[PDB]
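TEACHING EXERCISE
Course module: macromolecular assemblies
Task: Read the component lines below, then compare them to the predicted structure of the full complex.
Student: A.B.
Group: 4
Components provided:
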Amino acid sequence: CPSQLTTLGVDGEFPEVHLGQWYFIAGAAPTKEELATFDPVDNIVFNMAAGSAPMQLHLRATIRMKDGLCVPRKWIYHLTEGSTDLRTEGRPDMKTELFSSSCPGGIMLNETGQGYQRFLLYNRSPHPPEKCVEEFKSLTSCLDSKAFLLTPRNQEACELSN
Ligand SMILES: CCCCCCCCCCCCC/C=C/[C@@H](O)[C@@H](N)COP(=O)(O)O
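Instructor-supplied answer key:
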């Protein structure tokens, strides 16, 4: 260990490049309780799009549960003025920071809320090379987030409109 943690900033375009679909690959956190929300998940496809009011972004997803069910979700994020952090509507305690990852099609989030933090790994590919997952696990372990979750991604993605 020692960060090679590299921030992606939107205070400085980031939006246009990151539009479209992303897959949830893995999470890491100080303990398992703060990842357990993902235990029933087989896979998740997300779609990010521009918002319709200043500083807003639309995030949509469909979650494939391990029991085969498809569950639509949506959130509205807000870019904090003069900051690299994002807020999420309806969750006043929550903050998200974005980081580059070792793999080309990847992106890493750190989420914090009341009492917890977690790192979350996404990729443009639903099945990125195993090296991407390993590098994520190593980076986060060194940052003291040693509890780990890998999404199994054994089922098909659910439908999510463009
Ligand atoms: C707006 C993000 C800016 C980055 C845009 C490009 C990258 C997008 C990658 C996908 C990010 C998905 C983040 C969502 C995570 C949720 O699963 C958790 N917050 C749980 O939410 P819960 O189910 O508890 O509500």
